[PDB]
Amino acid sequence: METLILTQEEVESLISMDEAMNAVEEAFRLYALGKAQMPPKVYLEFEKGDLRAMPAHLMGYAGLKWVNSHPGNPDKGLPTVMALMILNSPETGFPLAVMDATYTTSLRTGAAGGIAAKYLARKNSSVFGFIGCGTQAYFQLEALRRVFDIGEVKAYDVREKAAKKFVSYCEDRGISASVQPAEEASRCDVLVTTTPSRKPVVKAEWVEEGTHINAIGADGPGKQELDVEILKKAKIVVDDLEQAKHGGEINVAVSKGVIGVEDVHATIGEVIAGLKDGRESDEEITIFDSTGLAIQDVAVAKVVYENALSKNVGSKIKFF
Amino acid sequence: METLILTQEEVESLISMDEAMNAVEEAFRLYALGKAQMPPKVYLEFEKGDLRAMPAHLMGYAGLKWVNSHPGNPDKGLPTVMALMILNSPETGFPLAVMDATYTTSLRTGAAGGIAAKYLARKNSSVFGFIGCGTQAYFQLEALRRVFDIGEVKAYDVREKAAKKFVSYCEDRGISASVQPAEEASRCDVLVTTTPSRKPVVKAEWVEEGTHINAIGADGPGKQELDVEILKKAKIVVDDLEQAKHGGEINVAVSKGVIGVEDVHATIGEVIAGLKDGRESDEEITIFDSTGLAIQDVAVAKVVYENALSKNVGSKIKFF
Ligand SMILES: NC(=O)c1ccc[n+]([C@@H]2O[C@H](COP(=O)([O-])OP(=O)(O)OC[C@H]3O[C@@H](n4cnc5c(N)ncnc54)[C@H](O)[C@@H]3O)[C@@H](O)[C@H]2O)c1
Ligand SMILES: NC(=O)c1ccc[n+]([C@@H]2O[C@H](COP(=O)([O-])OP(=O)(O)OC[C@H]3O[C@@H](n4cnc5c(N)ncnc54)[C@H](O)[C@@H]3O)[C@@H](O)[C@H]2O)c1
Ligand code: NA
Numbered sequence: 001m002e003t004l005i006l007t008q009e010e011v012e013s014l015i016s017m018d019e020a021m022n023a024v025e026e027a028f029r030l031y032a033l034g035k036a037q038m039p040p041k042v043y044l045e046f047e048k049g050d051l052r053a054m055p056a057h058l059m060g061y062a063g064l065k066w067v068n069s070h071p072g073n074p075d076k077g078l079p080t081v082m083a084l085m086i087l088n089s090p091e092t093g094f095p096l097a098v099m100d101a102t103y104t105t106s107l108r109t110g111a112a113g114g115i116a117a118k119y120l121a122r123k124n125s126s127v128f129g130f131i132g133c134g135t136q137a138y139f140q141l142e143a144l145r146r147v148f149d150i151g152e153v154k155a156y157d158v159r160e161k162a163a164k165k166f167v168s169y170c171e172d173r174g175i176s177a178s179v180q181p182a183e184e185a186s187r188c189d190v191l192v193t194t195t196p197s198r199k200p201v202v203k204a205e206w207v208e209e210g211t212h213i214n215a216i217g218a219d220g221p222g223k224q225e226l227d228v229e230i231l232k233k234a235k236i237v238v239d240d241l242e243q244a245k246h247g248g249e250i251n252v253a254v255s256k257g258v259i260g261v262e263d264v265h266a267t268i269g270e271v272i273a274g275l276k277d278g279r280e281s282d283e284e285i286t287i288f289d290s291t292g293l294a295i296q297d298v299a300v301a302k303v304v305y306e307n308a309l310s311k312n313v314g315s316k317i318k319f320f
Numbered sequence: 321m322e323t324l325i326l327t328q329e330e331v332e333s334l335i336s337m338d339e340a341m342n343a344v345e346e347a348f349r350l351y352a353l354g355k356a357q358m359p360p361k362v363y364l365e366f367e368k369g370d371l372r373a374m375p376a377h378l379m380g381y382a383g384l385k386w387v388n389s390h391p392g393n394p395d396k397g398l399p400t401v402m403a404l405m406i407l408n409s410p411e412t413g414f415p416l417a418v419m420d421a422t423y424t425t426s427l428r429t430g431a432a433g434g435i436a437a438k439y440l441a442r443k444n445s446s447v448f449g450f451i452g453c454g455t456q457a458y459f460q461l462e463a464l465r466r467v468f469d470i471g472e473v474k475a476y477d478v479r480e481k482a483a484k485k486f487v488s489y490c491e492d493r494g495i496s497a498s499v500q501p502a503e504e505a506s507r508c509d510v511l512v513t514t515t516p517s518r519k520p521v522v523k524a525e526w527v528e529e530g531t532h533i534n535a536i537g538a539d540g541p542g543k544q545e546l547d548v549e550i551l552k553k554a555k556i557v558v559d560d561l562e563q564a565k566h567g568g569e570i571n572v573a574v575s576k577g578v579i580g581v582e583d584v585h586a587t588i589g590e591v592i593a594g595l596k597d598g599r600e601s602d603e604e605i606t607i608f609d610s611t612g613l614a615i616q617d618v619a620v621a622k623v624v625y626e627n628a629l630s631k632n633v634g635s636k637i638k639f640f
């Protein structure tokens with residue numbers, strides 16, 4: 001028996017943002033129809049960071065992603081986030097592959113952002129605002145242009161160097177774009193928040209009617225990027241109800257009792273599956289609360305694995 | 321940097337049974353003292369088997385063992401049980417090694433049996449009987465050999481050649497061993513139950529006083545190996561309370577309501593750390609209910625990992 005070993009460089013050449021988008025969309029659809037299995041994430045907290053286990057079964061595969069988050073890592077000489085995915089066969093339990101999931105974690109988060117805006121944002125969106133111009137912002141930008149012709153990009157980062165680079169990246173591919181303060185960047189049709197802040201970075205009075213917000217940054221207890229008043233006034237569509245409660249953009253609000261569960265309109269899978277309506281009026285403010293789900297990592301790993309067999313990419317180890 | 325890769329053949333040459341028994345004994349102690357973290361197991365159920373995630377943090381390492389069980393695997397050209405352990409630095413979260421845990425899982429279970437008996441059986445034990453003779457019997461046997469001085473060995477199983485595959489293996493290294501059905505094997509100083517049964521296979525009657533029993537088989541909600549009565553009459557010492565009342569030897573009697581918390585004497589880690597006593601009478605019956613802990617897998621992976629670094633064994637992959 002042979003287990004395929006895939007490196008980050010290899011995995012990067014094995015999936016398309018479009019492939020990632022199709023896989024993530026079907027994953028949401030399947031989970032909402034009960035055709036996917038996914039236990040809650042498991043945390044192992046450390047003093048300098050943590051590790052999380054994210055197992056899932058769907059589309060004919062099973063797998064477990066084991067990701068860490070150590071902030072002091074860069075100030076040290078290593079990425080903050082490193083992830084490994086073990087892909088298995090549901091019929092034999094055999095470990096078909098051990099791959100880098102560092103890149104695909106960013107990729108499939110980008111893909112989800114793009115799929116959520118496709119279903120929730122006004123069909124006429126053209127102005128895209130970005131609060132935070134780090135790695136994830138680029139992936140969100142790339143997924144979104146698969147679904148919208150981007151008229152204008154307004155970019156804000158506390159690190160001006162990062163906003164200018166993102167702006168320059170846009171122009172390079174012909175997208176009109178400019179660096180902008182936070183209040184102005186927030187004025188748009190689709191607003192992508194991608195910061196790891198623990199206090200509001202976007203004010204309610206800055207958000208106009210009809211805005212769709214991809215709230216991506218918040219993913220751990222206490223993380224929070226939005227003025228809670230925005231939450232009260234919006235149709236909130238989460239990733240996974242329980243993961244949003246614990247660490248999504250809505251965690252602080254729910255914990256401090258500002259909004260309840262009736263305040264959550266649907267999960268993105270329910271909308272995609274037709275179990276709940278998505279955007280219903282032009283005036284409403286919509287929010288997609290993204291936390292990252294194991295079904296997205298397995299779906300996407302399935303594509304990397306099959307494309308890997310096809311191109312004879314990888315190396316092999318006989319573990320047993 | 322790189323991640324060390326270790327095959328089952330390599331791991332087998334990197335850890336001795338004595339190291340495993342010391343690693344495991346210390347893992348139980350440390351955890352009883354709150355010096356280790358271990359969240360519950362996470363399951364993924366499939367039509368023909370399952371996969372479980374077992375993460376733990378102790379001894380300066382963190383790791384996740386991802387292991388399956390597909391009963392129809394042998395008659396398909398695969399072992400029923402295969403497992404991989406990703407071992408990590410709690411400091412940077414970096415995955416130091418991805419190694420086989422198929423062999424060690426067996427090793428660390430025998431080791432546990434060996435440590436439990438060392439603390440719970442008559443210090444004069446010399447007659448051992450086995451109810452199973454399958455893979456695990458071999459590891460319990462090999463571990464018990466490092467603790468007590470054997471003389472005779474009573475061995476039974478619902479197959480006969482296996483009692484033979486076992487008896488001669490047992491004879492070959494120097495201990496008089498004979499096949500002897502349930503009733504016969506059942507009386508000894510140490511009884512080692514290693515079967516996947518679903519209803520008692522050992523009757524209250526059959527067991528003499530002063531017997532220490534390693535109840536190793538009961539692995540899930542369904543099975544039991546002992547006649548509930550034996551329970552009502554013994555020093556019951558568990559692995560982890562939560563896991564045993566869920567799927568260990570006590571889960572049925574507990575689910576039926578016959579025994580409860582109050583009836584479990586202690587955690588094996590508690591006896592080792594001396595927070596609870598062990599045998600206190602030559603007569604009393606003592607049972608070690610084993611379910612298998614992640615902390616045992618991580619504790620054993622640390623030994624494999626350090627010996628591998630020390631002997632320059634293993635291949636390397638640059639995942640990122
Ligand atoms: N939901 C998911 O599935 C998912 C997937 C990937 C990452 N994440 C989360 O995304 C964030 C990281 O995105 P990344 O990988 O690009 O990280 P990064 O550090 O490269 O990007 C974050 C950017 O935010 C900017 N920033 C920080 N504070 C700010 C503030 N107060 N206002 C404006 N800009 C600010 C930084 O200067 C940086 O350029 C974290 O919160 C992380 O945990 C979630
Ligand atoms: N608690 C723990 O730490 C731990 C660790 C590993 C395995 N397990 C459990 O070990 C058990 C089997 O070990 P393995 O996977 O090495 O096994 P195996 O299949 O290699 O051996 C089990 C043996 O039990 C015999 N057997 C089956 N039913 C019996 C019955 N009713 N009466 C008498 N003998 C019977 C079989 O013929 C077989 O030889 C399973 O229940 C498994 O879930 C528990
Ligand atoms: Na957020």
Ligand code: NA
Nearest residue numbers: 535536537538
């Ligand atoms: Na048992």
